[PDB]
Amino acid sequence: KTRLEKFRQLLSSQNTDLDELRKCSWPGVPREVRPITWRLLSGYLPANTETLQRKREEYFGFIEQYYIPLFQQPLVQEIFERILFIWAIRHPASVQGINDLVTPFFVVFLSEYVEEDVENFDVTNLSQDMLRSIEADSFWCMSKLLDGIQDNYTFAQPGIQKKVKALEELVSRIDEQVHNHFRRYEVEYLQFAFRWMNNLLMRELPLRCTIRLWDTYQSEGFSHFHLYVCAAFLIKWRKEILDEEDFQGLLMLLQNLPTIHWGNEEIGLLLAEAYRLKYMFADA
């Protein structure tokens, strides 16, 4: 059985074996079954029978209570703002620089109803109820993603500071040459790694790669795994990094690692490397 076929076998049953699905999703999810897989992996849609339109209605009940070129559409941008505004209202202890985090969920849920070229698709072409389902599903699946990293968005963002300190500790131990190169040109970890934590590396990768990365994050508690992905990401670019001979050139490269042409192969290689690091440095 092919990869796509194994997934369709798992998803055609009334009761989905969540453990087998997580195991199958860790090496990536076929594009064809990603919407339903993300609803299950996030925990939004329960796996066993022992709900969806009610969760969707609950989201619009919060809105009622208040009373890329695809992303250059005013309706798409207003939808991104609304989802985050509702999320912020629902989390009073808490982001704004996380508007990006909606994007992979929106593209994945839109791909369910769009054949090909979702990049140039006009959302005014979809029915209002279809667009409402994409919006409510993106809110609930992004809520599940943020639940694990809520410490990142509380007063003074303690989660991010702690995560960046965890990355420096890790990098100084795994790759002291790169660590000392940062110290030589006065590059602080927070100057490039803040955004890696805050946006879960999505500002460093093409959208397709973030989607493939989040298949694995959702198939896991991943908040600790991300730290090893960030470490693997720095090590992947260590030669280009060490070739930088100034603060400005070094910081620029760190914030714009050359991943434009990356796809599923590179993300798979990045994740396998992050697993190796986590395994090898688990007793440190």
> What's the tally of helices?
15
Shape: globular
From the N-terminal CA to the C-terminal CA, the straight-line distance is 41 Å
Number of domains: 2
Helix content: 55-70%
In N-to-C order, the SSE pattern is: HHHHHHHHHHHHHHH
Summarize the main sheet.
none
Class computed from helices, strands and strand pairing: mainly alpha
Residues in β-strands, percent? under 5%
Number of strands: 0
Multimerization status: monomer
What is Rg? 20 Å
PDB class: protein binding
Keywords: GTPase activator, TBC1, structural genomics, Structural Genomics Consortium, SGC, protein binding
Assembly: monomeric
Entry title: RabGAP domain of human TBC1D22B
Structural commentary:
With 284 residues, the protein is mostly helical. The protein folds into two domains: 1-155, no CATH class; 156-284, Cyclin A, domain 1, CATH 1.10.472. It is built from 15 helices and no strands.
Please write out the topology.
Blueprint: H1 3-11, H2 18-25, H3 34-42, H4 52-66, H5 74-90, H6 103-111, H7 128-147, H8 158-174, H9 176-184, H10 190-198, H11 207-219, H12 225-236, H13 238-242, H14 247-255, H15 264-280
Helix pairs in contact: 2-11, 4-7, 5-7, 6-7, 6-11, 8-9, 8-10, 8-12, 11-15, 12-15
